[PDB]
Design a protein around this ligand. Structure first.
Ligand SMILES: *NS(=O)(=O)NC[C@H]1O[C@@H](n2cnc3c(N)ncnc32)[C@H](O)[C@@H]1O
Ligand SMILES: [Mg+2]
Ligand SMILES: [Mg+2]
Lengths: 986, 76
């Protein structure tokens, strides 16, 4: 029922059941300014039943400071009726409509109501009703560098998944009668006290496998207790535990009764004392509105701030708040009251959107209940921030000028940025830049690059694209889409289709980087991140970095000559299974899917490529014999795929697939059991097939077995694809050909090496047809494509994996999970993407302000599934001492022209106090003080570029603009010392 | 004394420590329980990341303080 083609990546986060509940939940959203439109965007993409908008207030120019679906032609028109048109285009499955009147009884149509830009008085009126009529309530507001969220899902909300983690599971070694479970081979269970676990395959304790959950007591990383099990056996052996996730009832207080005793979610344990201050300040903001006819304090206005601060006093007394108010902090909220920052709406909007899904799915732990946030470190300090500088100017950026000022607005407009990636994070980043006015100045410019094209599943979280854009380039569409959002960016954006890396340094060279103000990553792999980081360090450019994984995300800022870089710290490495486990001793479905992916590659990819290389590369056989890891396999592929196993009909492909069945799910298993019989024992007398090793059983082909049949169809259709034969699916032709299959006899051989020559390969090479006879003939390889359900790729992998799962008695998996594993799909959705984009841009304004204190910057981490946000100051770059001078071990370098070797040596002695003893370039040694005097007399007058060319016996590439060198030298005390590298500017 | 470490996936780790203990020591105790190499541990207290060579006292970490153990992510 659920369109898996669109929701693939999001389904891997929320699950089918959750999205089924979403498709039955109407959502009402009050307010269509920046915050509300962001919430509505994510909710529409998410796939709720429908979205209803309510905002009769007319469009003002300052609303465009963050609301990206409003143009200057829409001024005066109510915001809801202008925004509905563009929200309906996001997701065809989510109708969007407007409502002009709000009736209390009309709220009963929605499972969740999001309230923005609404006074506290009206909030209480709405929440009083929703709280009594089983309607989820969410209220958020964006006020300058300050934000707030309130959630009330009722006092009997049942959460069915409180962390979004997959259930823990692991293999057991033993269980004592008193209930001590010992994990297998120092394998951590990962459980906590109070968790529940079921069991399966436990030997000696049959009743334990019945599936009754048992509370756990953790005794150590590899051991835990479940209580007495004497009534069930004397000793448990082997088996597998599986965590049982327990639901929790969450009782929310109403807005009225929690207003006195609010329960806070702290986004920053370094600002623990602020949420209470903000609780009072946001209420005082609504009292000010009611007093001044719905108007908020004017930007940086002292008179309005004094009156506001007085409201806080009255509210603090009315609520009996035993707290000493921080005047400077509270007044700062009044100064910024009219601030409308797109970054703040992205951050809050993404979070609120996730909370809406929590209310409609009962999945993930919701905010309970008050989330007060600030990014006050983003307030500029290099420019005058006064009532005169922040005053409105009648432009789309008034909401941003209210906080940063007009002098700062020009700095944003003249940025030259480089966005690496135009996917999820890329689209949100471009949207933010457009609303902020980045690169809209004379000297401003944006460069976007991405080598990929738009696909269906991208549309779930890459909102600049539309179904009709499928197949187009991401960087181009995103550039065009942003020009519509901010026409001031017309012609200011240059899009590339380049893959950032070593191969594209001719485009993204020295001349390209020198112009940039900063680099922003929007990548989906660590390799590209590490490369961009190296480049930014070399060109001394700031880097804004971010990543997401399902509901989790993070941000990191790299400040030249201040912080460490992205590559300065280590991350957990990517998991890889042992070859022995995949090749012969699988025990999880992940092991059979990885095996099936290699089988897919080994039947429909690798041999095809060898044939085409044999027919187009003149000396392929010779080179392969000298380089190939398995020359015999290459020769056999060519021999098999060109003559001995070449099919001439789809019937012959079916016969071929039938042979592959016994070759990989029977004959190979027999040979394995022949070398390791089921009852064989190790050197310690223990059964060989125990623990991680599961005794396999060969399969006997059965046409009436869906897994057997699915493998034949998928394998025959892929073999036909390789040769261009037309495939078929009518079961009658498979029954016709297979019913008459005489399998050749097979007997397990001896002397085969199963981990836990010269003549024959030269003879089969001569038996190959010469390429002279196959001029122009090629075969078509199968290029793995996980997102095309008509190519049989996932069909073959699913069937092949499950057949191997049947060999080893492993639980099979459907195409949905198999696609996830074989495809290495990263779960993702729009909510996390918006959140990181907001945090990234809150750090962007710090870079353009030139902030020099490391404590003002913040790296961000969050997990929306548990309402966890946390932040830390960046790590300073490691320092070093040379002749007493402080050297930055990451960012410092010696910049020199293309001078002579002598001039370089003299420069370092006289200007740096360093005696150059050795000078190197790459692997090459350019100079050393111990070289004979004739070697030096001929090199000292040479230029560095000349010295490099001669020593390397190779001319420098013509477009080279720099040269990197290293030196060994003694300091002023004659002692060897490490010093920064040298960059020669040619 | 006792301190708590909350991970980004919602797990809670309890440690037995003293204010004079080094971050390296705290990381060793986290490695024993979770298997995470010290160099891959990102600990945060009161908005500051804990660095090797310093002590808990250098960060005002006291009885029953809560640290965050976080990771970097690569989707996007
Ligand atoms: N996170 S995502 O999957 O939604 N999209 C990431 C986005 O980034 C692009 N990408 C990946 N690697 C590179 C390099 N090396 N250069 C430029 N862009 C790159 C992907 O195409 C994807 O669209
Ligand atoms: Mg793609
Ligand atoms: Mg990707």
């Amino acid at each position: 029922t659920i369109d898996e083609g669109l929701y693939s990546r999001q389904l891997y986060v929320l699950g089918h059941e959750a999205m089924k509940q979403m498709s039955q939940s109407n959502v009402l959203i009050i307010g269509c300014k920046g915050l509300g439109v962001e919430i509505a965007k994510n909710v529409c993409l998410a796939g709720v039943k429908s979205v209803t908008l309510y905002d009769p207030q007319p469009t003002r120019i300052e609303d465009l400071s963050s609301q990206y679906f409003l143009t200057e032609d829409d001024i005066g028109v109510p915001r809801a009726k202008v925004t509905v048109s563009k929200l309906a285009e996001l997701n065809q499955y989510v109708p969007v409509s407007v409502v002009d009147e709000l009736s209390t009884e009309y709220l009963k149509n929605f499972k969740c109501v999001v309230v923005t830009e609404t006074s506290l008085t009206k909030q209480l009126e709405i929440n009083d009703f929703t709280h009594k009529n089983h309607i989820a309530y969410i209220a958020a507001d964006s006020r300058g560098l300050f934000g707030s969220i309130f959630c009330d899902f009722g006092e009997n909300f049942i959460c069915t998944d409180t962390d979004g983690n997959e259930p823990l599971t692991g293999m057991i070694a033993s269980i004592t009668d008193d209930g001590v479970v010992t994990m297998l081979e120092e394998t951590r269970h990962g459980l906590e006290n109070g968790d529940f676990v079921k069991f399966t395959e436990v030997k000696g304790m049959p009743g334990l496998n019945d599936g009754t959950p048992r509370k756990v007591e953790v005794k150590g990383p590899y051991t835990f207790s479940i209580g007495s099990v004497k009534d069930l056996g004397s000793a448990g052996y082997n088996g597998v535990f599986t965590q049982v996730k327990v639901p929790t009832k969450i009782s929310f207080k109403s807005l009225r009764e929690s207003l006195k005793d609010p329960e806070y979610v702290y986004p920053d344990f370094g600002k623990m004392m602020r949420p209470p201050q903000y609780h009072i300040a946001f209420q005082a903001l609504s009292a000010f509105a009611d007093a001044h006819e719905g108007s908020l304090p004017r930007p940086r206005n002292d008179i309005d701030a004094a009156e506001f601060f007085e409201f806080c006093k009255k509210i603090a007394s009315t609520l009996q708040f035993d707290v000493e108010l921080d005047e400077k902090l509270i007044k700062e909220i009044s100064y910024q009251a009219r601030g409308d920052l797109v970054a703040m709406s992205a951050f809050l909007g993404g979070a609120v959107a996730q909370e809406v899904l929590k209310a409609t799915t009962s999945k993930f732990y919701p905010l309970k209940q008050y989330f007060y946030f600030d990014s006050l470190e983003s307030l500029p300090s290099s420019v005058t921030i006064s009532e005169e500088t922040c005053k409105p100017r009648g432009c789309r950026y008034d909401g941003q000028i209210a906080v940063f000022g007009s002098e700062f607005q020009e700095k944003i407009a003249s940025l030259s940025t480089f966005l690496v990636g135009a996917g999820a994070i890329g689209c949100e980043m471009l949207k933010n830049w457009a609303m902020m006015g980045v690169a809209t100045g004379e000297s401003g410019h944006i460069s976007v690059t991405d080598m990929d094209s738009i696909e269906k599943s991208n549309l779930n979280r890459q909102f600049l694209f539309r179904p009709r854009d499928v197949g187009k380039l991401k960087s181009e569409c995103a550039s065009t889409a942003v020009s519509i959002m901010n026409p001031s960016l017309t012609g200011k954006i240059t899009s590339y289709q380049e893959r950032v890396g070593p191969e594209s340094e001719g485009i993204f060279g020295d001349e390209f980087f020198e112009k940039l103000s900063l680099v922003t990553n929007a990548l989906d792999n660590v390799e590209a991140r590490m490369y961009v980081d190296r480049r930014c360090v070399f060109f001394e450019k700031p880097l804004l970095e971010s990543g997401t994984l399902g509901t989790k995300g993070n941000t990191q800022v790299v400040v030249p000559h201040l912080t460490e870089s992205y590559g300065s710290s280590q991350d957990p490495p990517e998991k890889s299974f042992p070859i022995c486990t995949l090749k012969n001793f699988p025990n999880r479905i992940e092991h059979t899917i990885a095996w099936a992916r290699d089988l897919f590659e080994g039947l429909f990819k690798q041999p095809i490529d060898n044939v085409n290389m044999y027919l187009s590369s003149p000396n392929f056989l010779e080179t392969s014999l000298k380089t190939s890891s398995n020359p015999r396999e290459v020769l056999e592929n060519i021999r098999d795929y060109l003559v001995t196993e070449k099919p001439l009909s789809f019937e012959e492909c079916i016969m071929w697939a039938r042979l592959q069945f016994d070759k990989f799910f029977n004959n190979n298993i027999q040979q394995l059991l022949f070398n390791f019989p089921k009852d064989s024992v190790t050197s310690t007398g223990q059964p060989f097939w125990s623990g991680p090793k599961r005794a396999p059983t060969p399969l006997s082909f059965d046409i009436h077995n869906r897994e057997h049949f699915d493998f034949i169809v998928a394998a025959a259709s892929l073999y036909a694809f390789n040769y261009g034969l037309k495939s078929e699916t009518d079961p009658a032709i498979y029954e016709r050909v297979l019913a008459g299959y005489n399998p050749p006899p097979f007997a397990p051989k001896s002397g085969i090496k199963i981990q836990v020559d010269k003549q024959e390969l030269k003879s089969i090479a001569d038996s190959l047809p010469p390429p002279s006879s196959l001029v122009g003939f090629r075969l078509t390889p199968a290029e793995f494509e996980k997102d095309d359900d008509s190519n049989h790729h996932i069909d073959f992998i699913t069937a092949a994996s499950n057949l191997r799962a049947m060999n080893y008695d492993i639980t099979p998996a459907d195409r949905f999970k198999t696609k996830f594993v074989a495809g290495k799909i990263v779960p993702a959705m729009c909510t996390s993407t918006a959140v990181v984009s907001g945090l990234v841009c809150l750090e962007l304004v710090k870079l353009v302000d030139g902030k020099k204190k490391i404590e003002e910057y913040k790296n961000g981490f969050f997990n929306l599934a548990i309402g966890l946000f946390t932040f830390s100051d960046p790590i300073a770059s490691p320092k070093m001492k040379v002749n007493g001078k402080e050297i930055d071990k990451i960012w410092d370098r010696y910049n020199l022209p293309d001078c002579t070797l002598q001039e370089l040596i003299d420069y370092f002695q006289k200007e740096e106090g360093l005696e150059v003893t050795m000078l190197s370039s790459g692997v090459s040694l350019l100079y050393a003080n111990f070289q004979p005097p004739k070697k030096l007399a001929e090199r000292l007058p040479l230029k560095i570029s000349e010295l490099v060319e001669q020593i390397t016996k190779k001319k420098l590439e013509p477009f080279r603009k720099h040269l990197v060198l290293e030196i060994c030298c003694d300091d002023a005390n004659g002692e060897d010392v490490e010093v920064p590298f040298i960059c020669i500017k040619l | 004394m006792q301190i708590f470490v909350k991970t980004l996936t919602g797990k809670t780790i309890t440690l037995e420590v003293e204010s004079s203990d080094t971050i390296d020591n705290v990381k060793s105790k986290i490695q024993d329980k979770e298997g995470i190499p010290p160099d891959q541990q990102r600990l945060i207290f009161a908005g500051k990341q804990l660095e090797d060579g310093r002590t808990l006292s250098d960060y005002n970490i006291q009885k029953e303080s809560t640290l965050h153990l976080v990771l970097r992510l690569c989707g996007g």
